[PDB]
């Protein structure tokens, strides 16, 4: 069977599932941006941009 370190080689000759994995990576990265921003907004103090 495939070793663990080779699981994603199944996409090498499957252009659609390659596009599906690339879409999921993109979805997760945009997801992260959104969540990081909301956590930052929930913790940012804007009352003093000097000190």
């Amino acid at each position: 069977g495939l070793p663990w370190y080779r699981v994603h080689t199944v996409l090498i000759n499957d252009p659609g599932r390659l596009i599906a994995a690339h879409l999921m990576h993109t979805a997760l990265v945009a997801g992260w941006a959104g969540s990081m921003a909301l956590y930052e907004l929930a913790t940012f103090d804007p009352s003093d941009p000097v000190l």
Partner: protein, 122 residues
């Protein structure tokens, strides 16, 4: 003109004071031998400003604008009191009675809510 309750209800105009023409720039004489009264005084706020808390360094705090969140519930009206003529000639109004307070909540940037008793009591 002589509008009616049913003309006005629900429009937001019950919270507005009456107004005088662009052309009412005359003058009302005070017969010092005479006695007077405000038969109706109406105050209608149009902006609320709150002083901001300047940091320990400070430099100066300014009055910042705020969002009204309690609707057309803010005006003071039907206020009465006597207009005396003093001896140096000045006029002094002394409130007796009237709807002379409104609670009001406005909201500062960032989301802090600030209640206040908008009043001219006494």
């Amino acid at each position: 003109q002589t509008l009616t309750y049913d003309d006005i209800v629900g429009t937001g105009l019950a919270n507005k004071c009456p107004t005088l023409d662009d052309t009412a720039r005359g003058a009302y004489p005070i017969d010092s031998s005479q006695t007077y009264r405000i038969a109706r005084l109406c105050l209608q706020p149009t902006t609320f400003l709150v002083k901001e808390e300047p940091k320990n360094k400070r430099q100066e705090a300014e009055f910042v604008p705020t969002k009204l969140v309690t609707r057309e519930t803010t005006s003071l009206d039907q206020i009465q009191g006597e207009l005396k003529v003093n001896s140096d000639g000045s006029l002094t109004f002394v409130e007796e009675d009237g709807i002379d307070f409104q609670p009001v909540t406005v909201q500062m940037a960032g989301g802090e809510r600030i209640p206040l008793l908008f009043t001219v009591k006494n």
